[PDB]
Design a binder for this molecule. Structure first.
Ligand code: ASP
Ligand code: ASP
Lengths: 232, 231
């Protein structure tokens, strides 16, 4: 199998499902006590998230490109970035590191494509929902259109991610609020919902979503597994 | 903070508690969204575990020393090996890698020392329970003596580790069996119980142990946090 290189810590809470599912994927395919060959660089999320709010995206591109290059030298054979928001600077990583870069939005777009859907709801950080870097790739490469919540809903969705989810707090109040937003986008004709923040899956089980769930972290991890074994 | 280097995936299920507890310790200490600087090398445990059964210990020493050296060169400032059994080959890592090596038995010995205890039960793989490499360090460095289960109990304890715990299977029958062994070693005057396999705490909650619990993984993670920020 190939050694996968993970850029994690963003937050570390959502790096864990990546680690778990990549190992469970290898066990499923290889059987026995086999586990995945993983190199993980977990960053201090404080610096990353600070740059997000300052708009210092070039600085985060440096941080992540350096991290990927260090994993390359350690033997990583592909790069997985464990965060939807930071694919805003995926170009920097793909440009400065020659390793194959498994873009989260490609794995998500193939999953939605496989379910035959072109109009889906999108939850994530305010950056991922409101800007073009994520939604524009889904549109240009898969002809997939995203519906996002209203402004007041986006601010609270974003607040929960950073003030609760990334600190390990999963409240039923926030869980029920996310379910409520999903249900409103369902009435706009959304066919599925992207959990487009890697932590949302930690808060919202699939039976709380009135609509079929695309969990970016699960989907990304399965794409990692398929790369490590040269499958799918 | 110093970036920590983890040698994990032995098994990956016990690597997760390390990653969680190290991050939580950094958060508690720096506050806010601060997270731990971590480089993890997770190996394929199949090759390691087969080597244990074949007695190919030198081969695992090479694997782990090479892994440690790769992490050092990626920026690792200290090494944490996320497994009790493989400290049998800690000498290979410490001899070939100049980084500070945070020995799991030293972290556990200071915890038992802090509790004022000198006679404890030891649960773990058959290798950790029966051989000298782990218990001999506790004896030499801390004057701590370990009591271990009888032979039939050791075989089933080890059995559960590799056929259930390392596969993510946590059964009540196994949990109850471990609980009965702990209650049995308590009869021999064990003052506490070392969970000397990093997966045992995933199975046995502290409230199922009639003895005070030294969870090796938790203690090791707390020591790593203390190192990373020089406490
Ligand atoms: N990890 C979350 C939050 C973040 O990275 O800002 C995401 O996928 O967007
Ligand atoms: N992780 C277990 C099993 C092993 O690595 O052999 C231990 O601490 O000993």
């Amino acid at each position: 199998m190939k050694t996968i290189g993970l850029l994690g810590g963003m937050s570390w809470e959502s790096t864990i499902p990546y680690y778990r599912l990549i190992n469970e994927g290898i066990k499923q395919r290889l059987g026995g006590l086999h586990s995945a060959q993983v190199l993980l660089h977990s960053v201090d999320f404080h610096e990353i998230e600070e740059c997000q709010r300052r708009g210092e995206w070039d600085k985060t591109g440096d941080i992540l490109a350096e991290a990927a290059l260090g994993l390359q030298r350690a033997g990583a054979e592909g790069i997985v970035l464990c965060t939807n928001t930071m694919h805003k600077v995926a170009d920097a990583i793909e440009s400065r590191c020659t390793l194959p870069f498994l873009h989260i939005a490609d794995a998500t777009g193939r999953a939605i494509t496989g379910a035959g859907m072109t109009r889906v709801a999108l939850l994530g950080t305010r950056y991922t929902m409101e800007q073009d870097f994520y939604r524009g790739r889904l549109t240009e490469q898969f002809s997939i259109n995203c519906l996002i919540p209203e402004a007041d809903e986006r601010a609270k969705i974003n607040q929960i991610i950073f003030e609760e989810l990334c600190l390990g707090q999963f409240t039923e109040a926030s869980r029920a609020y996310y379910a409520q937003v999903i249900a409103r986008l369902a009435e706009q004709g959304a066919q599925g919902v992207i959990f487009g923040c890697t932590e949302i899956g930690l808060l919202v089980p699939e039976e709380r979503s009135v609509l079929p769930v695309f969990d970016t972290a699960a989907i990304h991890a399965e794409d990692a597994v398929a790369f490590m074994l040269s499958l799918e």
